[PDB]
Amino acid sequence: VQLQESGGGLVQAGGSLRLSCTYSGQTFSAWAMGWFRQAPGKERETVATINWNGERTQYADAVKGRFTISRDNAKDTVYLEMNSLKPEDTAVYYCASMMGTYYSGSPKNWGQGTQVTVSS
Amino acid sequence: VTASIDLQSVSYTDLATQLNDVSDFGKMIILKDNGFNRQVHVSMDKRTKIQLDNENVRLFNGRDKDSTSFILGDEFAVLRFYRNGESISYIAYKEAQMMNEIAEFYAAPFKKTRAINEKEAFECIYDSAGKDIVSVKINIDKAKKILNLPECDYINDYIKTPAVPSEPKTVYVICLRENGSTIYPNEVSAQMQDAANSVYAVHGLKRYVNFHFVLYTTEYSCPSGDAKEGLEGFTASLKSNPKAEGYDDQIYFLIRWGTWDNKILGMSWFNSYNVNTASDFEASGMSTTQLMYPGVMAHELGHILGAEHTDNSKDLMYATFTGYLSHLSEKNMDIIAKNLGWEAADGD
Ligand SMILES: [Zn+2]
């Protein structure tokens, strides 16, 4: 199974990005999916997780109201729509399939990760 | 002192007298090896009932941190735990003739193996001029690696069909010994225990189901080695049996020791059980019960309850045999639970 992020890059503060994560694998719909991020010298953190059928979502406090996680089981892709970006959202952003529930599960298959740099 | 079990001499009466002392509030037992020294809190498993040919078989659990379970009948007892992530079974039959037949049964696959290697995977435990065997110790993972047998699987093992309750609903899992097959109680009870527990672990499902396995013999046997043909024939035979009328809303397993053609471990009708609509013996399947392949009945029961194949090789529902006993897929967890009456508004 292989996971590919995309849609990152440079963006000015207040701007918007839309990450996409493509799932090469037979049972995309079996798993909950999450977005995570890690900035240099900082611990990884969860950004958002989503139901296996896209109906239920969970957001980190720092991004609630600003980020939206969605999935298209029809195209085997999970999305992070990011609005109102702040410098502190700068990190490598990874998507991951997870074991268990979207609220208490564990990421297992990681993507390459894409860079997001928000400037001032 | 705390009660203790010496795994270097553990016998059927060792296990019987210890487990038979487990009251309704549980009991601490020390699992005692050489310097290895795990303490486990043992409780009766009140979720699951089992008769094998009307012989009553009781299950016991540790806490989750203990990673430990027991099986106890009048004729035999099983302890299974994990050490460095490897499943290890101590199997002890009460009667000496049966215990020797069991020990020769598990030793025979190693007849060509170097004895140095063999003691990792399989070991006789002796009574403290011929020795008496009181139990055997099997590490199935090591066993698989020593014997290096060809892999089995499930590739194509499902056919397209055809509030919180005040108390769990009783679902009978009626298992039938295929005509002519040699089936051993420790191996069948282990499959049953694993099948039931793979469900209860999902969405607190013990509030909704208490499984009741029974085992008898059927006159039916598979006409070929083809698993589909076999299941089709087995479902037909349940509709033929008058000894089964009135029980078309239960779950049915044909069981045997060996596999079917193409190293297929089992088969079942996909998504054929729902606590509201079960009918017409549709929730039926077949399952191997040999010890080397734990979890097969669990895998087949998942299919019956709606769980699909998944692409994680650590999932119970991987399409290739893995040895793993737990549902990892949120999709599968929700549909199995849904089929047993659960809704997300109920919580876990
Ligand atoms: Zn299967």
Author numbering:
A (entry chain F): 2 to 121
B (entry chain A): 34 to 161, 166 to 199, 212 to 397
Question: What does the publication say?
Answer:
ETBF can secrete an enterotoxin termed B. fragilis toxin (BFT), which is the most potent weapon of ETBF and encoded by the bft gene. The pre-protein of BFT consists of 397 amino acid residues with an 18-residue signal peptide for secretion, a 193-residue prodomain, and a 186-residue catalytic domain. The prodomain inhibits the catalytic domain activity via an aspartate-switch mechanism. The fragipain (Fpn) can cleave BFT-preproprotein into two discrete fragments, the auto-inhibitory prodomain is cleaved off, BFT is activated and the catalytic domain is released from the bacterial cell.
In this study, we focused on screening for specific BFT1 (full length without signal peptide) nanobodies. Fourteen high-affinity nanobodies were separately crystallized with BFT1. Fortunately, we obtained two complex crystal structures, BFT1:Nb2.82 and BFT1:Nb3.27. The crystallographic structure of the BFT1:Nb2.82 crystals in space group P212121 was solved to 1.66 Å and that of BFT1:Nb3.27 in space group C121 was solved to 2.25 Å. Nb2.82 targets BFT1 prodomain and Nb3.27 targets BFT1 catalytic domain. The CDR loops of Nb2.82 mainly recognize the α-helix in the BFT1 prodomain, while Nb3.27 mainly interacts with the α-helix in BFT1 catalytic domain. The Nb3.27 has CDR1 to 3, comprising 8 residues (Gly26 to Ala33), 8 residues (Ile51 to Thr58), and 14 residues (Ala97 to Asn110), respectively. The amino acids of the CDR1 loop of Nb3.27 form 8 hydrogen bonds with BFT1, the CDR2 forms three hydrogen bonds and one salt bridge and the CDR3 forms four hydrogen bonds. Fourteen different nanobodies against BFT1 had an affinity ranging from 0.36 to 11.5 nM, the affinities of Nb2.14, Nb3.17, and Nb3.27 were between 0.36~0.828 nM, the affinities of 9 nanobodies (Nb2.29, Nb2.41, Nb3.43, Nb3.40, Nb3.63, Nb2.37, Nb3.4, Nb3.93, and Nb2.40) were between 1.18~8.72 nM, whereas the affinities of Nb2.55 and Nb2.82 were 10.6 nM and 11.5 nM. The BFT1 and nanobody can form a stable and compact heterodimer.
